[model samples]
Target: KDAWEIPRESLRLEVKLGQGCFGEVWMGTWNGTTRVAIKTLEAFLQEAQVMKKLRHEKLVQLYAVVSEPIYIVMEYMSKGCLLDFLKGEMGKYLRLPQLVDMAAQIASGMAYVERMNYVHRDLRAANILVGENLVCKVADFGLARLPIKWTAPEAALYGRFTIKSDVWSFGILLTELTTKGRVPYPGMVNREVLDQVERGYRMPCPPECPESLHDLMCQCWRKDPEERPTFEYLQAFLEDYFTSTEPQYQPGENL
Candidate 1:
């Protein structure tokens, strides 16, 4: 199902948000009260239709769409994307619980995607958004493309996309959370990254990262995609890890 098509005049573009390969995203107001992120891309309208039915707390929700110099309106994430937020001062002081919670939230969202029989293709920190109260939401669905880092060996080598590939990127995102947004496979170029991964080189664990979490990351990077744990499994493990270790994390307390 497609999203409601709003008139172009109904949206007030307030400020430029960011520019990327797809197009520029803007911070704008919709119908006055609704603050939104408006992205310019006619090619991704099908993605808007996809977003229309996919409902999850951890996934960014698409609101309205417009044709003819297309604009896709979505809920604005106040804290911006996950990678940038992690690099900022606020991310520096995050407790272990907070990091684990973010990972768990991502896993939860991915599980829903998996259930819906869709591959995220891009599950890195840059594609994730952060909101108030430390909420993390997965975004940038149709925009994630090829020839980039944060891909599994199968996808990198053969251009194959599956849920397992997204798991691999999730592992990288876990590494980002542990390292406060360090780039995956740092100090290596694209060819170098592909070469190393093809040769079975996994990124090193972040300093002081929990052994269990590190072990999970290793599982996701397994040479064979089938060997990687499913998003369903990850969601269970992460939720359990947080609940068992951090008893203080009540409904709205520790969050």
Candidate 2:
């Protein structure tokens, strides 16, 4: 059977999961066995062929597409959206390593997308999903628009978006990861964020974030898009740090 165009009867939607920026997401089952997430949209621009071309473990797998009413069948992440997950119960005890791990996973996924020659025009914390063991996968392909705060200055002012803009968004996404989902430029309005960014203002280091990672975030926001680190570099840098640093544990000495 063709995995691209799925038979309706093979899949069934169950309890409501949550709402997305574009539509309603539901926990669904494929072939009455495999669990999947179904995102149903009202009016989506067509990009099925491009999605079909992107195959990656760090990316949410688009298993199939249903025509009637339009449901996108994607790999189900047990933990759901990154922002809500980090801000909720899970936020209580995630140490630096796990936070760094999440960023690395996203970079890995974005690296693949970059290699595929696709710019994820819209990249944000909510657009990434978390699964069991705190694994993160990049989700939500934008056939639409985005936010000023996350948008690169070039994209916001002159309407240009390359992978560099995506790099800038990753920097903002890092802020969300460290702050546990607080929106970028917390106090300022979109206009202010835009103005400050254009004037060469970068965000302050997030709470408890390491200096190195914060510097990386700043590098991602460099004014010249060409100067920004590619997703490949981001993935390597993060993965190296994650591998070198062991999670610190201070046990009360029972002398």
Candidate 3:
């Protein structure tokens, strides 16, 4: 299906937001009242096609597109990217409920994608956006890459990506959130990270991360993709975590 077309003249670019592999993202206004995030990209067709079909509360909404040089106008996330927010000094102030909320939201979004039969080849904290009320939504599809540090073993070895591959990335993403955006695999280079993961080594649980959540992460990183949980399963499990008696935070602990 095709995305809705918007006239280029209606957009008013404001501030330069940030840069990505594809192009720069900008803080912009639509017409005269709507605030938006405009991301420039060289390859717009495929991403736009995907975005057009995706509509969920946990997914960033694509509002318009400009063809000359390619601009994608999306719903503005006041809090910006999830990785930047989590790594900022303010991240320390996040409470257990807030963190759980963010994780649950991302999982919910991914579950929606799973139901739609779409695999978010790139699912990471950096690619997620934090909106008002600290709601996190999955974003950025134009810059999807081959299986690497954050990819599943099959993807890295044979370029075979399926819904299960996204599950693997989500496990890595769990580490990123628990550690407040710390790099996955820590000191290892990309090649080493891939090799280690292929050999059955997975990232250790971050400090203060709940054991149940850590166990879930391990399940997601299973060497055999068939053994990994589906997004629907992950969504249900994380949602159940909030209702359980498990402690959300541990004092004097640092990730």
Question: Judged by lDDT against the true structure, how good is candidate 2?
Answer: 0.83
TM-score of each: 0.89, 0.90, 0.92
The segments of candidate 2 whose C-alpha lies over 4 angstroms from its true place after superposition are: 1-3, 42-47, 144-146, 242-255
What is the full ranking by lDDT, best candidate first? 1, 2, 3
lDDT of 3 by residue, 1-255 (tens): 244778778899899877666677899999989999887763565676688888999999989876657888899998888999999986987755677678888999999988888888989998999988888999976543323777898987898888898999999898888888888888999888877777789888688887788898999889889999998888877777766636454544453
In model 3, which regions exceed 4 Å deviation? 1-3, 143-147, 245-252
Best by TM-score: 3
Candidate 2 per-residue lDDT over residues 1-255, each given as its tens digit: 245888778889997887855678899999889998887873352545466778889988888887747887889999999989988998867776777788999999999988878888779998899999999999877442228888899998898988899999999999998888898998999988888888889999976776778899999999999999999999888887754543342222110
Q: Which regions in candidate 1 have their CA more than 4 angstroms from the true location?
A: 1-3, 143-147, 243-255
How does each model score on lDDT?
A: 0.83, 0.83, 0.82
Quote the lDDT for 114 in model 2.
88
Worst 10 residues of 2 by lDDT: 246-255
Model 1 steric clash pairs: none
lDDT of 3 at 63: 94
Question: Per-residue lDDT of 135-168 in model 1, one digit per residue for the tens?
Answer: 9998977743323578898887788899899999
Judging by lDDT, tell me the better candidate of 1 and 3: 1
